[PDB]
């Protein structure tokens with residue numbers, strides 16, 4: 001009936017969007033020789049998809065090196081992450097110029113976490129220190145430390161007004177949440193795209209942990225979807241890929257033409273999802 | 282409230298033999314309503330089909346339905362085979378005619394089986410019409426004949442255009458065919474092989490699907506994920522349309538069908 005014809009149109013419209021969807025991949029500095037091997041293999045694999053750009057997380061660092069290793073190994077725009085943790089404004093400016101003179105003109109401005117300065121201040125700083133393409137974080141399901149939804153929302157506009165080139169959302173599994181949030185944004189005056197951050201889930205346990213610490217919700221249907229798969233890595237991957245592909249299908253239909261993938265240094269899942277989006281070698 | 286069944290085929294090599302039993306153990310934990318095994322005239326013969334059925338029965342205690350064709354087989358041979366199965370606990374048979382290399386049609390086999398014993402009988406249905414049918418009307422009338430002859434249920438040829446199945450089911454009901462029209466689901470991980478199958482059976486492959494597998498000839502892992510996504514989508518749609526039974530053409534592989542069943546609520 002309707003559900004049948006709807007899926008056909010939805011799959012067809014996605015098939016036609018092949019070629020005009022931008023994707024970016026997020027990685028993290030490896031802590032072992034094994035993970036280093038995995039990372040550089042995922043980078044080589046995902047590079048064939050010619051992403052808009054790739055980013056590297058910032059702890060508290062090999063971040064700078066990896067960025068460098070990428071820009072010259074593949075020649076892709078590498079955007080390093082930067083926080084306000086354990087660093088003074090003077091040091092920050094140092095690092096800033098230390099990147100600009102290295103070909104790095106794209107940075108993901110973030111506050112960071114501790115076990116007194118906000119992201120907004122870092123945005124203005126990078127803008128005060130130079131003119132980088134600032135990418136900040138957005139939270140469709142409100143950041144934990146936010147006073148209220150509107151308060152958190154107003155902060156994003158504050159970061160955008162500060163000079164943020166674009167916003168990248170925290171991962172989510174409730175598509176409605178993202179959509180209504182994106183509406184709330186434009187309805188608030190923010191004129192930048194709220195690029196959805198996609199987390200392809202193969203390890204539900206880890207994913208559930210991340211969610212609890214980021215105030216992200218795990219809809220019941222999803223919890224049921226992975227229930228009983230603790231010892232079935234292969235099935236978890238198929239189920240996880242299915243969920244991600246469906247999510248990115250709905251978003252694509254809703255006009256979203258940009259996606260940021262939390263690869264966790266793995267390429268296959270993100271690679272497959274991109275494939276369904278028309279992003280191929 | 283969803284029931285499932287899995288179809289396997291007689292292995293022709295030691296490696297496939299290994300693969301098959303690994304899949305049987307894996308899938309058996311899902312407690313399928315029944316499992317079936319195909320028949321290949323020039324690819325295994327009925328002894329190989331019989332062998333697998335006996336193996337499944339003795340090893341899992343699951344209902345195993347052998348596929349039986351009436352081509353190049355005399356009525357007396359068929360009765361002998363039928364009686365042999367029945368006395369050995371095999372009470373479900375997928376009655377098929379088999380491809381012509383007229384004699385007797387599937388409906389004739391159904392009638393012949395019911396005479397031997399009160400067998401549980403499943404017959405083939407084609408949402409996109411059997412390729413040799415004089416017409417869609419005649420092909421449907423034939424399904425009616427097979428059901429009227431004693432067929433307990435119909436199992437459709439695989440399809441990728443879900444609406445073709447939905448429209449077909451409606452025609453069956455309008456035709457008075459009251460048995461269940463169980464959709465045959467083909468999870469695709471090897472598109473080239475699936476396209477060959479589809480082309481030989483006039484099963485339509487939607488443009489979006491052909492595009493989905495384009496460029497993955499040497500990427501088995503991506504084909505699996507894409508295929509699983511397509512399959513899970515289909516069963517979800519079908520499930521919402523009242524389908525309570527699914528038959529999986531596992532091709533002797535378990536992962537894809539296992540995952541799909543999981544997303545359907547069918548778990549160990």
Ligand SMILES: Cc1cc2nc3c(=O)[nH]c(=O)nc-3n(C[C@H](O)[C@H](O)[C@H](O)COP(=O)(O)OP(=O)(O)OC[C@H]3O[C@@H](n4cnc5c(N)ncnc54)[C@H](O)[C@@H]3O)c2cc1C
Nearest residue numbers: 057058081110111112118119137143145146152155168170
């Ligand atoms: C794409 C992405 C990448 C990330 N990468 C990393 C990484 O590499 N390294 C890392 O350490 N962390 C990373 N994080 C996590 C992030 O640093 C944490 O979520 C952290 O809690 C700070 O958030 P923020 O950067 O959005 O800062 P902010 O935008 O400052 O938001 C944090 C909180 O401060 C509140 N707020 C802002 N201004 C004010 C004000 N003036 N008064 C009162 N309240 C205010 C906000 O409402 C919010 O609750 C990432 C997150 C995303 C979504």
Ligand SMILES: Cc1cc2nc3c(=O)[nH]c(=O)nc-3n(C[C@H](O)[C@H](O)[C@H](O)COP(=O)(O)OP(=O)(O)OC[C@H]3O[C@@H](n4cnc5c(N)ncnc54)[C@H](O)[C@@H]3O)c2cc1C
Nearest residue numbers: 319320348377378379380386387405411413414420436438
């Ligand atoms: C679930 C399923 C399982 C299968 N398993 C196997 C298997 O294990 N082994 C194997 O060899 N094949 C198998 N097949 C394939 C099948 O045997 C072929 O499609 C075969 O050509 C027809 O078999 P049937 O049982 O549908 O025969 P029938 O139902 O007799 O149909 C065949 C054709 O004859 C027509 N017809 C019926 N009566 C008449 C009449 N009196 N005059 C003229 N035309 C008539 C029908 O409209 C149709 O075109 C399977 C198919 C399905 C869908």
Ligand SMILES: NC(=O)C1=CN([C@@H]2O[C@H](COP(=O)(O)OP(=O)(O)OC[C@H]3O[C@@H](n4cnc5c(N)ncnc54)[C@H](O)[C@@H]3O)[C@@H](O)[C@H]2O)C=CC1
Nearest residue numbers: 027028029057058059060113170171210211213214262264
């Ligand atoms: N989206 C988020 O909320 C992110 C938060 N972070 C925080 O910054 C820290 C330093 O970065 P790394 O060196 O990469 O840490 P890490 O090496 O301990 O973690 C590696 C990667 O796992 C993922 N991850 C870890 N904790 C996460 C969380 N709570 N939520 C979502 N994803 C998470 C991220 O991709 C991270 O890059 C992380 O430990 C984490 O606390 C980092 C990336 C994303």
Ligand SMILES: NC(=O)C1=CN([C@@H]2O[C@H](COP(=O)(O)OP(=O)(O)OC[C@H]3O[C@@H](n4cnc5c(N)ncnc54)[C@H](O)[C@@H]3O)[C@@H](O)[C@H]2O)C=CC1
Nearest residue numbers: 289290291319320321322323324325438478481482530532
């Ligand atoms: N569901 C269907 O349409 C089936 C059709 N058949 C036909 O009967 C012939 C003889 O049987 P086998 O010796 O097993 O052949 P085979 O040995 O060439 O094929 C082995 C198995 O692969 C699967 N298969 C092959 N072709 C298929 C098709 N077109 N559609 C769906 N599944 C297919 C079946 O499980 C079959 O048992 C097959 O070659 C095929 O043409 C057999 C089983 C199922």
